[PDB]
Design a protein around this ligand. Structure first.
Ligand code: NI
Length: 84
RNA sequence: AGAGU
């Protein structure tokens, strides 16, 4: 069995934080062709991994702690703006 | 309203 990813150690000073969302809004956070979550990464200077379709709906957000926190808030605000 | 070789 093969795949096309691997697990990498963070650079020193960079943390990875698990951002859980409701199951029904994973696709909403990603957006079409990733447009929403690519924008959040670009705006917050973070690296984000979308959960697998068959796993818990937890994004992993990697970067400086202050940037990761901003990305977390961007994800939560995007959800809230669309779901109230 | 699911992007990544
Ligand atoms: Ni392959």
């Amino acid at each position: 069995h093969h795949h096309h990813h691997h697990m990498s150690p963070n650079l020193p000073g960079q943390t990875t934080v698990q951002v859980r969302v409701p199951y029904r809004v994973v696709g909403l956070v990603v957006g079409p062709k990733g447009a929403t979550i690519k924008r959040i990464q670009q705006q917050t200077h973070t690296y984000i991994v979308t959960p697998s379709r068959d796993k818990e709906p937890v994004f992993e957000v990697t970067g400086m702690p202050e940037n990761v926190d901003r990305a977390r808030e961007e994800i939560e605000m995007h959800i809230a703006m669309r779901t109230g």
